[PDB]
Design a protein around this motif. Structure first.
Motif, PDB file in Angstrom:
ATOM      1  N   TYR A 172       8.209   0.191   4.492  1.00 54.85           N
ATOM      2  CA  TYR A 172       6.895   0.420   3.924  1.00 54.85           C
ATOM      3  C   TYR A 172       6.355   1.754   4.414  1.00 54.85           C
ATOM      4  CZ  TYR A 172       6.998  -4.469   2.540  1.00 54.85           C
ATOM      5  OH  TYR A 172       7.335  -5.674   1.966  1.00 54.85           O
ATOM      6  N   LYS A 216      -0.835   0.561   2.140  1.00 59.88           N
ATOM      7  CA  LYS A 216       0.543   0.107   2.281  1.00 59.88           C
ATOM      8  C   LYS A 216       1.241   0.049   0.925  1.00 59.88           C
ATOM      9  CE  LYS A 216       3.232  -3.614   4.474  1.00 59.88           C
ATOM     10  NZ  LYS A 216       3.109  -4.979   5.057  1.00 59.88           N
ATOM     11  N   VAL A 224       5.582  -0.155  -0.838  1.00 60.17           N
ATOM     12  CA  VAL A 224       7.022  -0.054  -0.648  1.00 60.17           C
ATOM     13  C   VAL A 224       7.394   1.417  -0.607  1.00 60.17           C
ATOM     14  CG1 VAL A 224       9.283  -0.485  -1.686  1.00 60.17           C
ATOM     15  CG2 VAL A 224       7.550  -2.294  -1.655  1.00 60.17           C
TER      16      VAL A 224
END
Ligand SMILES: O[C@@H]1[C@@H](O)[C@H](O)OC[C@H]1O
Ligand SMILES: O[C@@H]1[C@@H](O)[C@H](O)OC[C@H]1O
Ligand SMILES: O[C@@H]1[C@@H](O)[C@H](O)OC[C@H]1O
Ligand SMILES: [Fe+2]
Length: 287
Positions: free
Chosen positions: A165, A178, A180
């Motif tokens: 992340y 946050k 991926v």
């Protein structure tokens, strides 16, 4: 370039390499050892730890290291051994610390994990002059906290979910946004272990089960992959006179005797020259 096995150490779980004082410091978590490798002479030093020891960080204006032991965060010096600095978690969890980094503000970011590697009981912690703050939670095996050169992006890994992340890192140490960064689809048994960010902001990720490490652009695209004769590669570390010698710890943990006979340098320390320098190691501000 040519990869050299500079120390056929055969560590059980080589981890947490840092470049400090012009030498390479790292750990063998499961043998409970701190190791020190001097590339200029080849000299090797090892220190016994009273518990699993998982990371090392130097200290602003003070000798020795702050280290992660299963029983908590400790100060370490070869001359005096270990002294408890603070406990972070209920021992009932059977957690231990794992990976760590020091950001440019002297903050120590470190993860914890279920030592049994089954429960989603691990967390991310930020330890600075304001105390210890829990920053993320519910992760079985945390890994590879690191920050970009400009200090605005923070990366963190959920190893068993095969996902790194990215976060926005604020100047007061808070995380936001946050998302991926990289999800690993490099093979059934290939997991991201430890990571560091180089001077160009590229992420280098050691591959558990992937026989090497991958360099990722800031946009999350793999640009380079380094092969090592070791199935489990645990963490990269830039060292050498100009931080252009990329060191790797590796692990024999999890490999059968048959596989260890096939890859006998597993658990060794490897070094390879690279074209882009790493970031200089930062020291923790304990007070
Ligand atoms: O050998 C591993 C052990 O070290 C860990 O604590 O639990 C998982 C096992 O596979
Ligand atoms: O327990 C190991 C952990 O320390 C490492 O960082 O990731 C691989 C795991 O097996
Ligand atoms: O799918 C991922 C790809 O986007 C990245 O560039 O390399 C790693 C892969 O797992
Ligand atoms: Fe790790």
């Amino acid at each position: 370039a040519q990869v050299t096995c500079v120390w056929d150490l055969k560590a059980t779980l080589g981890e947490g390499p840092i470049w400090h004082g012009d030498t390479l410091w790292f750990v063998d978590i499961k043998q409970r050892k701190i190791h020190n490798y001097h590339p200029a002479t080849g000299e090797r030093f090892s220190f016994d730890a009273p518990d699993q020891v998982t990371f090392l960080a130097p200290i602003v204006g003070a000798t020795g290291f702050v280290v992660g032991l299963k029983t908590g965060i400790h100060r370490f010096h070869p001359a005096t051994g270990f002294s408890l600095l603070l406990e972070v978690e209920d021992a009932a969890l059977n957690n231990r610390p794992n990976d760590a980094t020091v950001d440019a503000q002297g903050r120590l970011w470190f993860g914890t994990m279920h030592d049994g590697e089954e429960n989603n009981s691990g967390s991310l912690y930020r330890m600075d002059l304001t105390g210890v703050a829990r920053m993320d939670r519910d992760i079985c095996i945390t890994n590879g906290p690191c920050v970009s050169p400009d200090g605005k992006t923070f990366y963190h890994t959920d190893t068993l979910e095969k996902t790194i992340y990215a976060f926005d890192l604020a100047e007061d140490g808070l995380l936001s946004n946050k998302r991926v960064f990289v999800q690993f689809a490099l093979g059934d048994d290939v997991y991201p272990d430890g990571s560091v960010v180089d001077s160009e902001g590229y992420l280098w990720t050691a591959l558990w089960g992937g026989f090497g490490a991958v360099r990722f652009s800031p946009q999350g695209d793999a640009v380079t992959r380094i092969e090592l004769p070791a199935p489990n590669v645990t963490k990269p570390c830039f060292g050498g006179p100009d931080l252009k010698t990329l060191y790797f710890t590796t692990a024999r943990k999890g490999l059968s005797d048959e596989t260890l006979a096939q890859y006998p340098l597993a658990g060794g320390v490897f070094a390879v020259p690279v074209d882009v320098a790493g970031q200089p190691q930062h020291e923790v501000r304990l007070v």
